[PDB]
Symmetry: D2
Subunit: 106 residues, 4 copies
Amino acid sequence: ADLEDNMETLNDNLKVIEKADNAAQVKDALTKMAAAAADAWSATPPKLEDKSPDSPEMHDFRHGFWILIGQIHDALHLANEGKVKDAQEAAEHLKTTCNHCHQKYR
Amino acid sequence: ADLEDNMETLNDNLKVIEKADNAAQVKDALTKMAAAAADAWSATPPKLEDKSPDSPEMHDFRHGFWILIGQIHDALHLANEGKVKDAQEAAEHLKTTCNHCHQKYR
Amino acid sequence: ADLEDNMETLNDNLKVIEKADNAAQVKDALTKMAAAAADAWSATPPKLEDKSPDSPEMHDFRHGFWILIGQIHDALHLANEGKVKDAQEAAEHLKTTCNHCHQKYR
Amino acid sequence: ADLEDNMETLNDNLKVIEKADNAAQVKDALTKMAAAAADAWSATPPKLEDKSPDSPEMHDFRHGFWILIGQIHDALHLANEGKVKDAQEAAEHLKTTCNHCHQKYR
Ligand code: HEC
Ligand code: HEC
Ligand code: HEC
Ligand code: HEC
Ligand SMILES: [Cl-]
Ligand SMILES: [Zn+2]
Ligand SMILES: [Zn+2]
Ligand SMILES: [Zn+2]
Ligand SMILES: [Zn+2]
Ligand SMILES: [Zn+2]
Ligand SMILES: [Zn+2]
Ligand SMILES: [Zn+2]
Ligand SMILES: [Zn+2]
Ligand SMILES: [Zn+2]
Ligand SMILES: [Zn+2]
Ligand SMILES: [Zn+2]
Ligand SMILES: [Zn+2]
Ligand SMILES: [Zn+2]
Ligand SMILES: [Zn+2]
């Protein structure tokens, strides 16, 4: 998918997690987020279209996805241990990584 | 790209790291390894084609890629820090993650 | 090496990072913060004095220090690659983790 | 505890995991290993006792404990999701991290 569609997948699944009843709903949504983040990895965003892939700016852009992917990994372990509310709350904290990238690169 | 071509990218760049004679060659190889691992995320290997996408087997397959991606992240920081031989040596330790997934799933 | 004193060390060194002129001051403060977090890992907080060491609350308490330690680790790598303003801004983001534990257990 | 007692705790609980009869034994042993690793973090080993705390060797020594602590963290999550065999096999893999530090500093 393109970068726009992977971002819509991240936004919509965050909302499904906040309104979940059960563990099954939370796990499935985190798995969809992990796939979207991994597919987005080598996208060039509009703001950096004149830069090389090996520039400081593109190395920094990719660093944001490493962090996001790490956080989704941990939240999914919480959900699979039966700590559903702890997983929802970790999902709420992911938003600061979202905002950090957007303020520099969007 | 498909799974077999992602694996050939991982294998070539591990050899570049070993024969490297400057820091730039090591940084560039690790970056290519990270891109290939993120692109492999979503693949279904031949041996698990008769399982569901949400099967315990496929969840465990994907967990191996989370582990590899995390180890590459740390190796790249070491290289950028000036600790280049330490980065090469950490790259050699990646082999046990490669071997673990192959024994279970290849 | 009691909990109160480890917390003073966390708070003091965060202010140092916020006011620093140079990269040496940031690296030293981050290293002191990691020491204090590792030293706090095994403490029993006053609010959980009545609980089993194996309770869900105490497992969760310890998990919070693992999260803080991982974030400090990343910020120090950024400082060591010359991305000093980025390490400073990352140190500021630590406050979300500080306050998440405080709201549950302080 | 001193460094020698922390290493005896690490060695003993690794054999406990290998020979475990049930899941509770594996979780307990991992939690004890994490405590010992966190307590060892600030120790000065005999081979480095004459160099300064800011030396590259002490920085590097401490980094190896961060790596060990992260691997125990992931293995405890696997045990708590019910993947206890996988947690046992992950614990076996820790040995290469133990051996790497011993090769360099013991
Ligand atoms: C960089 C490392 C990013 C991270 C981490 C996240 N996002 Fe993002 N997002 C990013 C860019 C560069 C853009 C602009 C893309 C463009 O072509 O215009 C976006 C955009 C969005 C959007 C909406 C705009 C659109 O797609 O048309 C949304 C809704 C969005 N991003 C959501 C989002 C969420 C929920 C994140 C974390 C969970 C997140 N993003 C992380 C770059 C990056
Ligand atoms: C699972 C999580 C894996 C990890 C981690 C790594 N590899 Fe892999 N590799 C995997 C599978 C399932 C397969 C079989 C692919 C097939 O279609 O048959 C492979 C294969 C390879 C190959 C052979 C490629 C071919 O065309 O047959 C190589 C050379 C290879 N893998 C290398 C490799 C390296 C160097 C890794 C780590 C650095 C690594 N792999 C990790 C699954 C997984
Ligand atoms: C739990 C996982 C915690 C994290 C992460 C952090 N803190 Fe904390 N802090 C915690 C507790 C249980 C307490 C109460 C201590 C008591 O005995 O009553 C505290 C306390 C503080 C204090 C006040 C200390 C005092 O003199 O009473 C400060 C100033 C403080 N904490 C700061 C702090 C900072 C800056 C953190 C992150 C950078 C942080 N804490 C994380 C539990 C936990
Ligand atoms: C450095 C970062 C280390 C890691 C990771 C591990 N070990 Fe270690 N170990 C280390 C040192 C410097 C020493 C020497 C201590 C001394 O004063 O001589 C050790 C020693 C041991 C010992 C022997 C203790 C003794 O009788 O003197 C054992 C049995 C041991 N270490 C086990 C061990 C295990 C099982 C580890 C991982 C699971 C491990 N160590 C990691 C430094 C470091
Ligand atoms: Cl080694
Ligand atoms: Zn965790
Ligand atoms: Zn899992
Ligand atoms: Zn961030
Ligand atoms: Zn930010
Ligand atoms: Zn090739
Ligand atoms: Zn590191
Ligand atoms: Zn970097
Ligand atoms: Zn492994
Ligand atoms: Zn294995
Ligand atoms: Zn990083
Ligand atoms: Zn919170
Ligand atoms: Zn994991
Ligand atoms: Zn847990
Ligand atoms: Zn080694």
